[PDB]
């Protein structure tokens, strides 16, 4: 597959209840491997995949140190945002940050990320050249100017091209037995009458990994979008994913419909029909 | 692991 490390931070201010809560989650591809939560009982970077659990005390000490540092920065950012947006210290606000690195086929950085949101909206994002920023508004333009003056794209690009990819390769090597897998979906078609004249055909894909999948319905070989419903891809609970797509069909016409499934764990796209 | 880098808003 094509591999990726990504962290997702959320800070949420809560005046009247102490410092903002900070939550960080780390992923290799679609596998969460670490977490930091400032509201955990002994806040530290905690393992969430067995393979990383074997990293020695240095890993946990430094990771915790950096997570706490990230937490503090987000506390400063929350305060700063109150200034930029003319807001009260007494209201609750949210910062979300995602950053990470995609490992290319040549072992080089294919694509890097560093993007944030304030109260659910774009704030500032690093462009794909990893050398420029997109600010969503006039408040974020303050940050842009700052980061342009302090050479932050350059510093963060060095991490993305160097250390980020080094960690990703280590993790991939260490947790190889479980991370470098492509589990194909278990697939099937079910049938559920709506009335005596209409029925729902539902095409299921279960137990697949990674989360990327394509599921479509055809009628007489034509892509159907009318009377169609595709649910958001959803976790199994066990590190797998699921999705379904349904079509509402006239009774008697069921056998004119095929479901089509594409996934990296499949040697060739699947074609399914209702097999009662 | 997180990056030692981080700049402010």
């Amino acid at each position: 597959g094509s591999h990726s490390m990504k962290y997702f931070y959320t800070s949420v201010s809560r005046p009247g209840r102490g410092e903002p809560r900070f939550i960080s989650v780390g992923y290799v591809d679609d596998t969460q491997f670490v977490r930091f939560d400032s509201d955990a009982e002994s806040p530290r970077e905690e393992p969430r995949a067995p393979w990383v659990e074997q990293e020695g005390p240095e890993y946990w000490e430094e990771a915790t140190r950096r997570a706490k540092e990230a937490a503090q920065t987000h506390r400063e950012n929350l305060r700063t945002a109150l200034r930029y947006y003319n807001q009260s210290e007494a209201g609750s606000h949210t910062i979300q940050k995602m950053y990470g690195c995609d490992l290319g086929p040549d072992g080089r950085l294919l694509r890097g990320y560093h993007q944030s949101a304030y109260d659910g909206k774009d704030y500032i994002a690093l462009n794909g050249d990893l050398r420029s920023w997109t600010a969503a508004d006039m408040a974020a333009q303050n940050t842009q100017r700052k980061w342009e003056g302090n050479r932050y794209a350059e510093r963060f690009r060095a991490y993305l091209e160097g250390e980020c990819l080094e960690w990703l390769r280590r993790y991939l090597e260490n947790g190889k037995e479980t991370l470098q897998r492509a589990d194909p979906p278990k697939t099937h078609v079910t049938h559920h009458p709506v009335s005596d004249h209409e029925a729902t055909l539902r095409c299921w894909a279960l137990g697949f990994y990674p989360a990327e999948i394509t599921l479509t319905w055809q009628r007489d070989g034509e892509e159907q979008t009318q009377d169609t419903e595709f649910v958001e891809t959803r976790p199994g609970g066990d590190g797998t994913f699921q999705k379904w797509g349904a079509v509402v069909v006239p009774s008697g016409e069921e056998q004119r419909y095929t479901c089509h499934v594409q996934h990296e764990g499949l040697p060739e796209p699947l074609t399914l029909r209702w097999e009662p | 692991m997180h990056p030692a880098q981080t700049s402010q808003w």
């Binding site: 959320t10 949420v12 949101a117 109260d119 959803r234 199994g236 379904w244 | -």
Partner: protein, 100 residues
């Protein structure tokens, strides 16, 4: 300060069979702000043990959480997920439907 109503999916880890142990999931997504309450109910009563994933989000900033517990489905019992969120006018309860 934008607000976004949660999507709710309640579903089993594995295709259900009466009497066969399984895992009951409630997947809530696409909500803002992140403050949310989710419960798993059996016959209208909160389950015994119900844990959740760490708060995360997708590339469009939309938050997601998985709430989960062990369950052994059967024809007599009803399972449900109940969500409370600022965007919802009192709780929204979604029943587990083995067809979904």
């Amino acid at each position: 300060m934008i607000q976004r109503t949660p999507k709710i999916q309640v579903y089993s880890r594995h295709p259900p069979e009466n009497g066969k142990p399984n895992f009951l999931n409630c997947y809530v997504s696409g909500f803002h702000p992140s403050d949310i309450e989710v419960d798993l109910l059996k016959n209208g009563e909160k389950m015994g043990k119900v844990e959740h994933s760490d708060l995360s989000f997708s590339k469009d900033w939309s938050f997601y959480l998985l709430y989960y517990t062990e369950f052994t489905p059967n024809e007599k019992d009803e399972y449900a997920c109940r969500v409370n969120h600022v965007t919802l006018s009192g709780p929204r309860t979604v029943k587990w439907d083995r067809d979904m």
